[PDB]
Design a binder for this molecule. Structure first.
Ligand code: MET
Ligand SMILES: [K+]
Ligand SMILES: [K+]
Ligand SMILES: [K+]
Ligand SMILES: [K+]
Ligand SMILES: [K+]
Ligand SMILES: [K+]
Ligand SMILES: [K+]
Ligand SMILES: [K+]
Ligand SMILES: [K+]
Ligand SMILES: [K+]
Ligand SMILES: [K+]
Ligand SMILES: [K+]
Ligand SMILES: [Mg+2]
Ligand SMILES: [Mg+2]
Ligand SMILES: [Mg+2]
Ligand SMILES: [Mg+2]
Ligand SMILES: [Mg+2]
Ligand SMILES: [Mg+2]
Ligand SMILES: [Mg+2]
Ligand SMILES: [Mg+2]
Ligand SMILES: [Mg+2]
Ligand SMILES: [Mg+2]
Ligand SMILES: [Mg+2]
Ligand SMILES: [Mg+2]
Ligand SMILES: [Mg+2]
Ligand SMILES: [Mg+2]
Ligand SMILES: [Mg+2]
Ligand SMILES: [Mg+2]
Ligand SMILES: [Mg+2]
Ligand SMILES: [Mg+2]
Ligand SMILES: [Mg+2]
Ligand SMILES: [Mg+2]
Ligand SMILES: [Mg+2]
Ligand SMILES: [Mg+2]
Ligand SMILES: [Mg+2]
Ligand SMILES: [Mg+2]
Ligand SMILES: [Mg+2]
Ligand SMILES: [Mg+2]
Ligand SMILES: [Mg+2]
Ligand SMILES: [Mg+2]
Ligand SMILES: [Mg+2]
Ligand SMILES: [Mg+2]
Ligand SMILES: [Mg+2]
Ligand SMILES: [Mg+2]
Ligand SMILES: [Mg+2]
Ligand SMILES: [Mg+2]
Ligand SMILES: [Mg+2]
Ligand SMILES: [Mg+2]
Ligand SMILES: [Mg+2]
Ligand SMILES: [Mg+2]
Ligand SMILES: [Mg+2]
Ligand SMILES: [Mg+2]
Ligand SMILES: [Mg+2]
Ligand SMILES: [Mg+2]
Ligand SMILES: [Mg+2]
Ligand SMILES: [Mg+2]
Ligand SMILES: [Mg+2]
Ligand SMILES: [Mg+2]
Ligand SMILES: [Mg+2]
Ligand SMILES: [Mg+2]
Ligand SMILES: [Mg+2]
Ligand SMILES: [Mg+2]
Ligand SMILES: [Mg+2]
Ligand SMILES: [Mg+2]
Ligand SMILES: [Mg+2]
Ligand SMILES: [Mg+2]
Ligand SMILES: [Mg+2]
Ligand SMILES: [Mg+2]
Ligand SMILES: [Mg+2]
Ligand SMILES: [Mg+2]
Ligand SMILES: [Mg+2]
Ligand SMILES: [Mg+2]
Ligand SMILES: [Mg+2]
Ligand SMILES: [Mg+2]
Ligand SMILES: [Mg+2]
Ligand SMILES: [Mg+2]
Ligand SMILES: [Mg+2]
Ligand SMILES: [Mg+2]
Ligand SMILES: [Mg+2]
Ligand SMILES: [Mg+2]
Ligand SMILES: [Mg+2]
Ligand SMILES: [Mg+2]
Ligand SMILES: [Mg+2]
Ligand SMILES: [Mg+2]
Ligand SMILES: [Mg+2]
Ligand SMILES: [Mg+2]
Ligand SMILES: [Mg+2]
Ligand SMILES: [Mg+2]
Ligand SMILES: [Mg+2]
Ligand SMILES: [Mg+2]
Ligand SMILES: [Mg+2]
Ligand SMILES: [Mg+2]
Lengths: 148, 107, 191, 95, 80, 166, 97, 140, 20
RNA sequence: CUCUUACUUUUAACCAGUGAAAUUGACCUGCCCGUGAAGAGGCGGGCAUAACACAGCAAGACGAGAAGACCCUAUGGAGCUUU
RNA sequence: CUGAACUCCUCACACCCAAUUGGACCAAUCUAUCACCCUAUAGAAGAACUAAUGUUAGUAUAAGUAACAUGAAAACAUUCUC
RNA sequence: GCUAAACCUAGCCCCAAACCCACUCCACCUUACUACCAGACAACCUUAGCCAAACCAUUUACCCAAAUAAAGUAUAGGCGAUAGAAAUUGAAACCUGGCGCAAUAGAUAUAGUACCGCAAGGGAAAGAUGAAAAAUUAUAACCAAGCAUAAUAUAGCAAGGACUAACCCCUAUACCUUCUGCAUAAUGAAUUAACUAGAAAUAACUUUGCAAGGAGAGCCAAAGCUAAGACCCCCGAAACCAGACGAGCUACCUAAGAACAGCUAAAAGAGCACACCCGUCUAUGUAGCAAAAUAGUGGGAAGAUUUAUAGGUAGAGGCGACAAACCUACCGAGCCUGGUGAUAGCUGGUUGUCCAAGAUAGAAUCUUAGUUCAACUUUAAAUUUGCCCACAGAACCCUCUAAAUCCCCUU
């Protein structure tokens, strides 16, 4: 423990206190880096490399419409509605090697991601889900056990 | 310390080594446990080491008694009448062989 | 340790009866300074760092780890000739002496663990024999565990139990990560 | 700092750190220079430009702010049109 | 009363040792003590001295006249 | 408490062989819980140590200490005990072999001092132990003479060796 | 002094009584029983400690929240003081900050 | 679970067995004995350096006594025996002084002869051969 | 300075009242 | 007071009875000089030195007693006064 | 010439710094399983006292010291002194 | 040899389960435990403060009734310390058990008794035979300190090296703490037995599982994730606040009582002087007879006197011919209980063995008796130069034309 002082006695000041000097985490001016963070919509990215990977292993069936329920069932993406998630965003990564023809419903989609889907003859549609419906569509089974 | 312990002068038994050398070790009494975990090394010594050791020391009578015991021990008795009891508790076969050989070389 | 709860508890200096008043003045008495008679330094005082029960030691290993432990224990029994497979556990007689002599004749060791597929469908002959025995224990297939297998020298499994064990243990090797507890309905579970 | 809260028994977050610093998911912390809005008339434009910069924190300050904030602020966020999205990961970093 | 057995067991051996020191037992023959095989000890007697003793002659060397008379007396007492 | 001194009169020795010498009779007696100080009783016990049975009684009879009467009473009942129970022919043929005092169980009482202070006094008790052995008292050890001193010194000079060498 | 002069009565332990023979049974009830029951549901004891672990402060907080209304007046007062002391000890005293 | 030390008696006796020969309460009271037993062990360890130191001093005194009986000083005997390539240490010379006086006198005479040869060499200009006992046996 | 008086503390009476 | 003396009582000392308290690291517990955390029974150089009671003395054991009341320190208290 | 724990010599080698830091072991106790004249492998914790003017109890030291008490004779009736 | 030592029970602790308890007769709110007479008196009313913010002044968690999760998020705040939801989410629930204590433990408990206080209140200690005591000459013994058996012989931290030999010879300045430094004449300790002091997050490391997934809904994830192991003491103030209990001592007051010889003067807050009240001076006493006394000498002693009984004024107060007096022996403001394990940058203490690395420029600070960051030190890890240094090179102004340094391949 040491010899005397607040060290051995265990009464040393709080974390961040600098012996009376104005602490670093206080003398820095406030800025809105995290202002309104809890009200920002978040979208889990879904790359075309990830989408192509799921189809090649049979985890996602391209012969049927693909939505948030099918992606979660195939363990393709993880959605946390309590963490301000609003769905999935289809990103353009891996557009060069994407070949499957699918009917996929997402929440956001970049211009290049749309083109890659439509090049193979597939259909991509961006649909909005509010926080209540997002939880229901991702895990239908827990909702059906609520008797609502 | 030296003051708190007895002392003696260097000597031998019956002037051993003058006319002929006589092994001062006379008897070894082993107590091993058939199931005791602390007697695992003692059992290993009996299986392969005590038989060869008896060949090299025809003048030493070795008694191996297998009875339940928590602390295996070996008792060494010498010609001059001194009796020394040493514990082989949780000792490997090599450590027991070194200890047994140490007892044979002492006067 | 996961289901262990320790009920040992001691009273600290704030829970021992009395001790509110300072026993004597701080200075002038010539004695050591004290502020209470229930201090841990005192006879009959509180305990400084003692048990503060009830205390829970609950923790859970990952489901696959606990499933793998059954596989290892089953493999050890087979590798050491401690596993025996029976078509059924039916006995010609309900006398417990028959079962003990049968184990001795077949050299099953001191303790034998008998496992049946279901508790309800256990034959009455084996139930009567095992109820009167201490080293022969009859458990259902759902009750198999590492501790019981390690405690008992010999493990006895029925043919339906072996198929039951393989289905349950190998299901962990080729299963998705759970979206929700498996008690809730699944497309292909149970069976 | 409250290491164990009286109602939940959990570590609490010092909200003074949140209002002043931004933590990139790579572990870095971004802050603004002190006094960048104070007495601008007596400061040269070269000095004023440095005050407007968004600077990083060193190892000690970054480690200090990690202890003063819970694991919620260290999670990976996917804000739409995030200005600092490109700075959440390191590139070509050795040792 | 402190819980445990090893400390009490260890103290019992110390008491037994002290009792022996206070009242030493009378000396007894090594043959009467455990771990004794007369035939084995006779053979080792020759081997220690590096002498090729005859077992028939060597055994008779340790047989005294008093021992024979005492042995005869014991047989008469027991009616053998 | 311990009462091992009373148990020393219950030892039965095996009968002696015809050629064995006569064994002196040993008598153990004691008095428990004497209202006296063991420190003061020690001087009386030390005084009669080694004396004959009759000489010890004479010294104690004319001693002004309180314990002298108590010790004399113990010797009188021990002397009768020897002849009556321990098979001693002559009651005067005894000497004090062992005689010492021991601490007994004491009671604590409060002694009041001034200024509200106090001290704890003890009501002291003691035990007296005596051992009587049949036979004339052993002669006192003669003082060491000049011949004994000179003989011992020469023996010391004849026992010294050359140290720290072969 | 301080050590007993006689051996204590021997310890007789029945290693094969019903409690020890059947110890650990059904610990895999979830794995081998279609996950109908969690193994934590086998724990018997205080209602505030079934399938839950924590330090002294967390246990005191949890017990007060769950059965605080059912506690005796003297027991509740000691629990409230214990939480106050533990709050000051953990959040204000120690070697590390 | 309350744990108490049940074998504290044996711990105390490990220190008191080394204090049995001490004088006073420090042979039976552990609080006082442990401090003295530790000092006794420390003195035992440090005395090994003095034992070697005292033995050599004793040997020098015994060698000096025997050397003076032959009219030689200690430096003359030790120094000149080295020059004769005689590597007898002070332990052996002390034994030789007590048990082999005739041999020691020969060693004293040999050192005296070598000492005289050194004096002649110093006075000589170097045009004479080395002394008979001044010759050194070379090793290769 | 002020008077520094320390009142005496009487020990319990039972400690000096035990009997055989 | 110069300048003290005599006697009596209490105490005292001895004998008998009863029997405290502060104190106490261990002590086999000398003197001189020097030294040293700067004032030594314990260290250095010398000197002295069979053992053990009893009664006196108050130079020393930085004597016992009271975690100095003086002084300062504490982001320790309190009483009082006030623009 | 004397002179160290320097260095050499025979053998062995982790085996001489406060605060602090790292590591190898371990007494006793309880529990699982062994063991069965007192142990083993592990799991646990009220888990180790030459020191707090520490707490309680026992007993020393000062110390048989300080201090304390009963007027006298007598036939125990009584009388006498104050 | 004593004194003593030893013991296994009494009971208790934490949970589960279940919702407890009042009265034979007689007495009991008046002075409780008192057979028998005119009441009309009647309950409600924000806790404060210690403490944290290193002062303090706003502020500083305290079951409020579903485990988990949302979440330590929204939000609040000298926007400091710290405080902190909700929508929503939704599980299990078989009393008779114990890696709980075993007479300094476990309740204080053999008992709220003995004892202490006017009261509120504080609050103990301990027992041990055996199948049979209607077997008591019984149940052997050995174990702490303290003694006894048995005092002592030059000289010295009481030991060590030794030695034929205890001593004599040689060598050696107790321990802990605290310090620049302690044999220090600095601290603590008579001694024995028992008791008495390191509690945890954040990451990180190590070892398993699974793997772009991990996890037995929530959460994390650009090799992660889950689980385990492993780090954070004890005693002590003067205080502050709330609620009770106290004027049987003392301060003053109220109701109704009592005492004051003799002499002088005879008028007396008059004099001399008993009882009585007070306590000037000196000696004794100082653990005393006494937590304020004894002996002598003194002040007053018909008065603003002294005194018995009952009553009144209560602590943010009373009362006071002000002495900061007195208010149950300790009043710059009582005492008890509670907040309370108050707090203490201050002091003291901090328990088994062994080995290894290890002495460190400063800066800020109501800060210099402390802390935080550097520096130094430690561990683990990554990969590459580190140290020592050849030339060449690093200022004019100026009185010391300094010892040197920086840079630096080679080695
Ligand atoms: C100086 O005078 C100092 N000793 C104070 C005296 S009154 C306590
Ligand atoms: K108690
Ligand atoms: K902390
Ligand atoms: K005169
Ligand atoms: K003096
Ligand atoms: K100290
Ligand atoms: K100090
Ligand atoms: K000094
Ligand atoms: K000093
Ligand atoms: K001092
Ligand atoms: K008085
Ligand atoms: K009143
Ligand atoms: K400070
Ligand atoms: Mg300290
Ligand atoms: Mg300091
Ligand atoms: Mg502390
Ligand atoms: Mg503080
Ligand atoms: Mg508490
Ligand atoms: Mg309390
Ligand atoms: Mg209080
Ligand atoms: Mg004191
Ligand atoms: Mg206190
Ligand atoms: Mg207690
Ligand atoms: Mg006394
Ligand atoms: Mg006197
Ligand atoms: Mg005393
Ligand atoms: Mg004392
Ligand atoms: Mg002496
Ligand atoms: Mg002396
Ligand atoms: Mg001096
Ligand atoms: Mg000297
Ligand atoms: Mg004297
Ligand atoms: Mg003093
Ligand atoms: Mg003085
Ligand atoms: Mg002071
Ligand atoms: Mg002052
Ligand atoms: Mg000041
Ligand atoms: Mg300050
Ligand atoms: Mg304050
Ligand atoms: Mg040398
Ligand atoms: Mg050496
Ligand atoms: Mg080495
Ligand atoms: Mg062991
Ligand atoms: Mg173990
Ligand atoms: Mg402890
Ligand atoms: Mg102790
Ligand atoms: Mg102590
Ligand atoms: Mg005495
Ligand atoms: Mg007297
Ligand atoms: Mg005296
Ligand atoms: Mg006197
Ligand atoms: Mg008188
Ligand atoms: Mg009188
Ligand atoms: Mg009543
Ligand atoms: Mg504060
Ligand atoms: Mg202040
Ligand atoms: Mg804010
Ligand atoms: Mg701050
Ligand atoms: Mg108790
Ligand atoms: Mg009860
Ligand atoms: Mg003793
Ligand atoms: Mg000396
Ligand atoms: Mg010396
Ligand atoms: Mg100083
Ligand atoms: Mg020094
Ligand atoms: Mg001194
Ligand atoms: Mg000192
Ligand atoms: Mg000091
Ligand atoms: Mg004491
Ligand atoms: Mg910890
Ligand atoms: Mg930890
Ligand atoms: Mg204290
Ligand atoms: Mg305040
Ligand atoms: Mg108040
Ligand atoms: Mg009144
Ligand atoms: Mg009136
Ligand atoms: Mg008058
Ligand atoms: Mg008048
Ligand atoms: Mg009066
Ligand atoms: Mg008056
Ligand atoms: Mg007058
Ligand atoms: Mg009132
Ligand atoms: Mg007045
Ligand atoms: Mg005034
Ligand atoms: Mg004034
Ligand atoms: Mg008062
Ligand atoms: Mg504190
Ligand atoms: Mg402070
Ligand atoms: Mg080192
Ligand atoms: Mg400031
Ligand atoms: Mg500083
Ligand atoms: Mg350099
Ligand atoms: Mg270089």
């Amino acid at each position: 423990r040491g010899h005397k002082g607040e060290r051995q006695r265990g009464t040393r000041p709080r974390l961040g206190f600098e012996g009376g000097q104005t602490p670093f985490y206080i003398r820095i001016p406030k800025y809105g880096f995290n202002e309104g963070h809890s009200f920002r919509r978040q979208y889990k990215p879904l790359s075309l490399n990830r989408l192509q990977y799921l189809i090649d292993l049979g985890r996602v069936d391209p012969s049927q419409p693909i939505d948030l329920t099918q992606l979660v069932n195939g363990r393709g993406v993880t959605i946390q509605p309590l963490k301000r998630d609003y769905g999935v965003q289809l990103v353009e990564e891996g557009a060069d090697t994407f070949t499957a023809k699918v009917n996929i419903e997402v929440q956001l989609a970049s211009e290049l991601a749309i083109a890659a889907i439509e090049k193979n003859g597939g259909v991509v549609t961006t649909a909005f889900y509010d926080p209540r419906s997002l939880d229901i569509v991702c895990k239908p089974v827990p909702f059906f056990l609520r008797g609502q | 310390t030296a003051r708190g312990t007895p002392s003696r002068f260097l000597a031998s038994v019956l002037h051993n080594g003058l006319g002929r050398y006589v092994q001062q070790l006379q008897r070894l009494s082993f107590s091993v446990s058939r199931d005791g975990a602390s007697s695992r090394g003692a059992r290993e010594f009996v299986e392969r080491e005590v038989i060869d050791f008896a060949r090299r020391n025809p003048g030493v009578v070795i008694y191996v008694n297998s009875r339940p015991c928590c602390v295996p021990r070996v008792v060494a008795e010498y010609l001059n009448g001194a009796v020394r009891e040493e514990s082989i508790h949780c000792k490997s076969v090599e450590e027991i062989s070194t200890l047994v050989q140490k007892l044979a070389d002492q006067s | 340790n996961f289901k262990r709860i320790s009920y040992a508890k001691t009273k600290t200096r704030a829970e021992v009866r009395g001790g509110g008043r300072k026993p004597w003045p701080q200075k002038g008495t010539g004695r050591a300074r004290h502020g209470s008679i229930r201090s841990p330094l005192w006879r009959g005082g509180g305990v400084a760092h003692g048990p503060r029960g009830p205390t829970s030691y609950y923790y859970m290993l990952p489901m696959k780890v606990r499933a793998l432990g059954l596989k290892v224990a089953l493999t050890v029994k087979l590798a050491q000739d401690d596993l025996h497979i029976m078509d059924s556990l039916e006995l010609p007689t309900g006398d417990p002496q028959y079962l003990t002599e049968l184990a001795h004749y077949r050299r099953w060791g001191d303790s034998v663990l008998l496992v049946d597929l279901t508790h309800e469908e256990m034959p009455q002959s084996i139930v009567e024999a095992t109820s009167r025995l201490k080293t022969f224990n009859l458990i259902p297939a759902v009750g198999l565990n590492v501790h019981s297998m390690l405690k008992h020298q010999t493990l006895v499994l029925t043919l339906p139990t072996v198929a039951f064990l393989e289905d349950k243990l190998l299901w962990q090797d080729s299963r998705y990560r759970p979206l929700y507890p498996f008690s809730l309905p699944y497309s292909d579970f149970p069976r | 700092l409250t290491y164990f809260s009286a109602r939940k028994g959990k570590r609490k977050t010092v909200k003074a750190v949140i209002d002043r610093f931004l933590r990139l998911h790579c572990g870095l912390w971004v802050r603004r220079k002190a006094g960048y809005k104070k007495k601008l008339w007596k400061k040269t434009p070269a000095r004023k430009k440095r005050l407007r910069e968004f600077v990083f924190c060193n190892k000690t300050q970054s480690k200090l702010l990690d202890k003063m904030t819970t694991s919620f602020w260290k999670r990976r966020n996917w804000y739409v049109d995030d200005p600092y999205q490109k700075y959440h990961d390191r590139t070509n970093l050795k040792v | 009363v402190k819980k445990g057995f090893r400390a009490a067991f260890r103290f019992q051996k110390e008491l037994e040792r002290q009792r022996l020191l206070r009242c030493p037992p009378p000396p007894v023959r090594r043959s009467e003590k455990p771990n004794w095989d007369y035939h084995a000890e006779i053979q080792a007697f020759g081997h220690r001295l590096q002498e090729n003793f005859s077992l028939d002659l060597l055994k008779t060397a340790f047989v005294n006249s008093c021992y024979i008379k005492s042995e005869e007396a014991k047989r008469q007492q027991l009616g053998i | 408490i311990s009462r091992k001194w009373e148990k020393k009169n219950k030892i039965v020795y095996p009968p002696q062989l015809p050629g064995e010498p006569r064994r002196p009779a040993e008598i153990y007696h004691c008095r428990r819980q004497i209202k006296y100080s063991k420190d003061k009783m020690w001087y009386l016990a030390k005084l009669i140590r080694g004396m004959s049975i009759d000489q010890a009684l004479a010294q104690l009879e004319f001693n002004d200490k309180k314990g002298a009467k108590i010790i004399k009473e113990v010797l009188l009942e021990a002397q009768d005990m020897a002849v009556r129970d321990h098979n001693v022919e002559f009651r005067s043929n005894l000497y004090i072999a062992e005689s010492t005092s021991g601490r007994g169980q004491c009671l604590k009482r409060i002694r009041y001092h001034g200024r509200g202070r106090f001290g704890i006094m003890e009501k002291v008790y003691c035990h007296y132990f005596v051992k009587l052995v049949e036979g004339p008292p052993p002669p006192p050890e003669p003082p060491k003479t000049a011949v004994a001193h000179a003989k011992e010194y020469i023996q010391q000079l004849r026992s010294r060796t050359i140290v720290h060498t072969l | 002094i301080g050590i007993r002069l006689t051996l204590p009565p021997p310890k007789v332990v029945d290693r094969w009584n019903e409690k020890r023979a059947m110890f650990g049974v059904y610990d895999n009830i979830g794995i081998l029983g279609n996950f109908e029951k969690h193994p934590k549901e086998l724990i018997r004891g205080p209602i505030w400690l079934r399938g839950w672990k924590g330090n002294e402060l967390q246990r005191c907080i949890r017990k007060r929240k769950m059965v605080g209304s059912r506690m005796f007046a003297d027991d509740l007062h000691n629990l409230n003081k214990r939480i106050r002391y533990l709050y000051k000890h953990f959040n204000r005293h120690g070697k590390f900050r | 679970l309350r744990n108490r030390v049940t074998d504290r008696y044996f711990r105390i006796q490990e220190v008191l067995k080394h204090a049995r020969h001490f004088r006073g309460r420090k042979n039976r009271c552990y609080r006082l004995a442990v401090r003295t037993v530790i000092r006794a062990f420390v003195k035992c360890t440090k005395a090994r350096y003095l034992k070697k130191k005292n033995m050599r001093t004793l040997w020098i005194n015994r060698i000096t006594a025997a050397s003076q009986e032959h009219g030689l000083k200690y430096p003359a005997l030790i120094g000149n025996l080295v020059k004769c390539q005689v590597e007898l240490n002070r332990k052996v010379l002390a034994d030789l002084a007590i048990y082999e006086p005739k041999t020691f006198k020969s060693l004293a005479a040999l050192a005296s002869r070598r000492r005289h040869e050194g004096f002649a060499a110093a006075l000589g200009d170097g045009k004479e051969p080395e002394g008979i006992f001044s010759r050194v046996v070379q090793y290769h | 300075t002020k008077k520094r008086f320390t009142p005496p503390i009487y020990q319990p009476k039972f400690k000096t009242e035990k009997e055989f």
